[PDB]
Structure 1
Amino acid sequence: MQIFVKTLTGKTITLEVESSDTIDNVKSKIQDKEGIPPDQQRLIFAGKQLEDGRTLSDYNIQKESTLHSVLRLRGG
């Protein structure tokens, strides 16, 4: 399938995805390609947070959709 994510440094990548693959697997193909730490990266669709454990099918996202990857942190 196909999804595009912009990164925090202003670089977006083109990825190949499939309704059956788990979101963790795709977050890792990208970690190898551009290096975004998966536990420190959050993929979102229309104000909802994506869980590495559900497949992209359950989140009705169709071909060519754009997701926002965001960072999480506290420190205290």
Structure 2
Amino acid sequence: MQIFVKTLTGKTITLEVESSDTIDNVKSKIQDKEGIPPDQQRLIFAGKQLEDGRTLSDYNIQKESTLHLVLRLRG
């Protein structure tokens, strides 16, 4: 399927992913497309922050899903 991720700067990135794709796989795709390391990526869907070790289907991510990427530190 295809998903769209909007960054805190408003940039929209399209990803060809699958429901069975792991969070690590999508983070690796985002790193390849933008250079953001997977540990630094903070993805939120439906108010739930994506975490490593799980899959998109674990977050009920479906066709044409919209995600929010917040590349931010703390402090």
**Cα contact 2:6–2:13 (8 A) shared by 1:** yes
The alignment covers a number of residue pairs equal to 75
Answering whether residue 64 of structure 2 is matched by residue 64 of structure 1, we say yes
Q: CA deviation at 1:34?
A: 1.6
Deviations 1:48-76 (A, max 9, x none): 111121111121121001100113423x7
Gaps of 5+ in 2: none
What is the alpha-carbon root mean square deviation over aligned residues? 1.7
- The percent identity for this pair of structures is 99
Show the counterpart of 2:54.
54
Higher helix fraction (1 or 2): 2
TM score, norm. by length of structure 1:
0.82
Larger radius of gyration: 1
Tell me if structure 1 keeps the 8 A contact 2:2–2:16. Answer: yes
Deviation at 1:44, TM superposition (A): 0.4
Report SS of the residue matched to 2:33: helix
Q: Confirm or deny: 8 A CA contact 2:8 2:68 kept in the other structure.
A: no
Q: CA deviation at 1:7?
A: 2.4
Normalised TM-score (structure 2): 0.83
Shift in CA distance, 8/35, structure 1 to aligned 2, threshold 3 Å: farther
CA deviation vs aligned residue, 1:11-48 (integer Å, no higher than 9, x gap):
21110111212111111112111222221110101111
Q: Secondary structure of 2:4's partner?
A: strand
User: Which 4+ stretches in 1 moved above 4 angstroms?
Assistant: none
